Structures are given as structure tokens and as C-alpha cells.
Amino acid sequence: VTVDQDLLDAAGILPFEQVDIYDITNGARLTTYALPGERGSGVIGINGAAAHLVKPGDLVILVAYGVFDEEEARNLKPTVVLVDERNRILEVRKG
Amino acid sequence: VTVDQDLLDAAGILPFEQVDIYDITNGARLTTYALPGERGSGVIGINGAAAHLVKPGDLVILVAYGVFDEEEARNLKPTVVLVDERNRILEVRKG
Amino acid sequence: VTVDQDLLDAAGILPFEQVDIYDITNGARLTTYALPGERGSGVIGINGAAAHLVKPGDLVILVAYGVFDEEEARNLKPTVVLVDERNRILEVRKG
């Protein structure tokens, strides 16, 4: 899944990091990884086999999970990036 | 999945921790994360794309998995929270 | 999934390592592990239950994910092995 790098930057998701895609439009759920897309383009591209399940026009949720030590897990404040219909950042929430 | 925090407390599952949901009513199985819900409300809310698979009225099992060292894994006693039809705690079992 | 070991060598995927298979032909997505196949045979064999979802003639993508420390994750350059219709290596890309 190619993602406008501005969005990866705001989310704190690294290129090549594994991410789950939960499709709001059709309910599909899959695991793949993120690739950096042209900054400011608002691109969200589905490459490969995933194209069978996630289609252009679909509304999706990209989620990244990490492995935490007991201490860091209890202090974790997840980052949530909210975007508009063109995938431009509207707001970023912390924990 | 928003979960009455009293239940998260009893289970030892942290807010934002990844959890699997296995649907007893329809057989759906998915991975998502837990969010703290109002204490004592008995809330079990399905937000986002997961709503396509898990419906209000469904009976479900929420399971959390951790990564253990050899020693801790052999001494592990999983916590099981049993609840009633209103999601109130009936009993908590250890290992 | 039995894989020509020349391909495992080029990819840096170890025998017995867990791998996901994303089917380009039919959209199936599953998790299994790799087994070393005869070198130069170009074998890509689906053994066991996975045979229900991935069929001979299918085009697939085999992906391996690792668990990284913060530092190594930021310097990671994934290996991509491109092959022909007989599963012979055409090119190997780095990051």
C-alpha cells in the first residue's frame, strides 16, 4: 500500500512497516506493508493481490501495531491521523 | 472495540492492546485493538470496519496474546473473565 | 510452501521462516512457512490445507516480516526477488 509520505510522517509509520487495512466500504481486512508515496499527492495505492479486496474509492483504516515492553506499553499514546476526501491531513490526535 | 474498563482491568488487557475477536454467533474472526469504555456500563462497542462482521447482539470472545520469555511462558496463568448478558463480571479465573 | 532454495537464498528467507502468501490470481491471503526446494528446479509447491486456496498456475507473492529494533528498522532495505514464468531469478532489488 503506497501512502503519501506526509501521512506516514504524521502517523509515525515507517516505510516498509507492516500495516493492517480494514475496509470501511466492504469489510475486507488484510495485512500488508506501507510504501512511501509522493508527498502531498494524497495517494493511497493498493498494489498486488490486495487489489482483489480493496478498490479505488473505498474508505479504509490503516493500522500499525508494535511490540512493547511493559513500561512503554503503559505510557503509550497512539497517534491518529484524520484526513479529508483527498487524503489531506485535517488533524492528528495523540493517545 | 470499546470495552467497559472494569472488564479490561479484570482481564489485565491494556487500552490500545491488540486483541482478537472470535464471534460465537456467526463465526467471524478478526484482529483489532481495545479502547477503554465507561466503567460499569457493560459496553462492548464495535467501531469502524469491524462493524461489517460483528453485530450488536452477537456473543463474542476477546483474546489477547503476549510475547513471552521461556521462563515466564512456562509459569503463565492466563486470566479468564466470565460475564453475564449485561457484561457484568460473574467470575475471574486464573490459569 | 516448498521454494527453490536458490530463491530463498536470494531473498534472505530462511527455511522454516513464516511467510505470507498473497495470491495475485484469486486474491487469497494466508500465512504458512517456507521449506527448501531442489535448487534450480524453480519449484513453488503448496502442501497441506493451503492447497484449497492456492492452485498450480497461480501467480503469488511470498512476503516475510521480521521484528526490528528502532535503529535497524530505520535503516532496513527490503530484498525483492523478481522471477520469470519458470521461477528463475531475473533481478534482485535492495530497499
Partner: peptide, 23 residues
């Protein structure tokens, strides 16, 4: 014990393109 936790997400993004047969 190490815990697997949700650390980040991009919410309600719109898919703009797809390429099943890319390389």
C-alpha cells in the same frame, strides 16, 4: 511479557488507485 499494541493509524483514508499486476 511484551505486549502487541496499536501505535498509529490513518483513519478513513480514500483509496485513490490500485494495480493488481504491478512489479
Amino acid at each position: 511479557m511484551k505486549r502487541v499494541m496499536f501505535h498509529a493509524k490513518i483513519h478513513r483514508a480514500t483509496v485513490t488507485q490500485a494495480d493488481l499486476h504491478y512489479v
